[PDB]
Amino acid sequence: SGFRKMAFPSGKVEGCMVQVTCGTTTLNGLWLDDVVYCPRHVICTSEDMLNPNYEDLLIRKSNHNFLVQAGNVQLRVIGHSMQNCVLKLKVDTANPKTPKYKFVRIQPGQTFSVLACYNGSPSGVYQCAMRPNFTIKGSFLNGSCGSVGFNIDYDCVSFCYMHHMELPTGVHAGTDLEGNFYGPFVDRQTAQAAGTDTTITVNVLAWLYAAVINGDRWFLNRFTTTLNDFNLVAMKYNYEPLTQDHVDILGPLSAQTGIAVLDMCASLKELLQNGMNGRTILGSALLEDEFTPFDVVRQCSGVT
Amino acid sequence: SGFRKMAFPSGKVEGCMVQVTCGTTTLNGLWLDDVVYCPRHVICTSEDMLNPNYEDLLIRKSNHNFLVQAGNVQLRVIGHSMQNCVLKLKVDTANPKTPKYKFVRIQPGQTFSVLACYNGSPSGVYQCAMRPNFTIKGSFLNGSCGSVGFNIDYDCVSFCYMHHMELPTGVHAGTDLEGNFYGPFVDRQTAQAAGTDTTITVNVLAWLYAAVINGDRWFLNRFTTTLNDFNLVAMKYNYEPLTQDHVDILGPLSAQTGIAVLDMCASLKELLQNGMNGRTILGSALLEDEFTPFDVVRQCSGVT
Ligand SMILES: O=C(NCCc1ccncc1)c1ccccc1F
Ligand SMILES: O=C(NCCc1ccncc1)c1ccccc1F
């Protein structure tokens, strides 16, 4: 009973966080096996960040210029390389707390947990989604770069995000753990405007199913619709188009509630057209879109 | 930049979660030093729960009837006792992962992190508040009892909540780690209705300060008020009375923004009277009350 914005337990990731300092810049690194991953902008002065040539700046850096601290113990850097927008610092000690892990590149609308860190130390954990414009709406201050986003599948941590920057609009951009930015963003202090932050329709529908499972049912109506009709309304309200693939993904929730996906679409259509009228769904006055169908099933079934 | 509902990192608590089985009932226990704490209702059949005499039911239980499993290793129970509504199972092995800890009894309006567990295994972490009616709005399924609520102060875990039950209205009740229920609730399957779930005014004001710090400023108005005038409006809207103690607690946020507490009260008064008019504050269409002033300062300053 009840439905919360829920993060994965963070312990397995806490065991991987280190501090990386290059000159006067301190941020976070991820220590897996004998490699520490961090944003390549650790090598930049705030001045460098206006138009950095990373290959040229990196030539001036030696292994001994990368200070890596795990708790209050220094790690020995025996190699460094740049992969896209991350540095890989090879250290002489494998992290003894390395969990089973994968690097995965997520799609827009997929959710993940962020372990916000400063100076290699965990401050908090929260749940994010990759937005359709490839931003995330995080909570990050100076020093949080290198904080990571992840999912867990029982005992395997899938790392999907590393924090790199804040856009002038206070939204966040970063990379996968291969160093490739999500979306069109670059690690330079320049004009980078985000595109339309559309609503993740399939996630909203998942969350309406979660609401019905948890006894919030007032928005259920007498109507149905078609994908094409629903999509006309979605487009008007800057919702993502719903595909048959999304309908298929919602099948288990439909079966759990006995509410046909297209009937739930017709409920969502009325909520878009009519508003909430001062009512709430699962404690929200807006339609929540940062739960995936998989998240709803996981939280409604108590997976560990 | 940005502001998220943020939980404490959970690793230190993950290291304390065990499974407790008595007959056919499995739930979670908290293993600190050589004691495992769990809800006393572990000894009840669902039938027992209608009118349990816990002293009488416990007479039929021996140490060897309490099965305690830490990961896939059995712990040896060498003593048991009932303290209020918790059992303390003395085991022959001190938890090697025991963090620095305290047991604290929180006040209504105080927030904490919950590590939701099943079979002694962590499923997720989320942020809660003790409601003014001494319920919490959690996310708990069968098997989640004994899951705990906590705060961290650097390296010391203050445990404040252990999950015991779900009211017919789908809200949650539990104890401190001395086994005393929050509010009037009992560990019996009976008629237990919650009182008014009033809004935690001081937390709303904290969150409006968080909003201004993070650039959401549209709701700032030209007005001020007095505690007495504000309180007339609070009472009308089922908000908690604001006290001078709350004004004093908001002092650092007032100083950080240069917005007098009573000016922010006048902004909140207009939001109550006028509504949001389809606008959002920090991604919310309602006034959020599960961030304390301490939470806002912590998240806005990046404490680890
Ligand atoms: O440090 C600052 N801004 C960068 C914050 C940031 C957030 C998220 N990810 C990366 C970096 C700052 C501090 C004080 C005053 C003005 C500022 F601009
Ligand atoms: O197991 C059930 N309900 C108790 C859940 C619960 C939640 C939170 N804290 C303690 C207990 C249940 C399962 C299937 C059908 C009907 C039910 F009632």
Side-chain angles (χ1 to χ4, degrees), chain A residues 1, chain B residues 140-142 144-145 163-166 172:
Chain A
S1 60
Chain B
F140 289 119
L141 303 167
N142 188 229
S144 63
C145 296
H163 186 52
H164 289 238
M165 64 198 202
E166 137 199 290
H172 300 118

Side-chain angles (χ1 to χ4, degrees), chain A residues 1 4 139-140 166 299, chain B residues 1 4 137 139-140 166 299:
Chain A
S1 60
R4 277 284 183 177
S139 179
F140 289 119
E166 137 199 290
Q299 180 173 168
Chain B
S1 60
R4 277 284 183 177
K137 298 175 164 140
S139 179
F140 289 119
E166 137 199 290
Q299 180 173 168

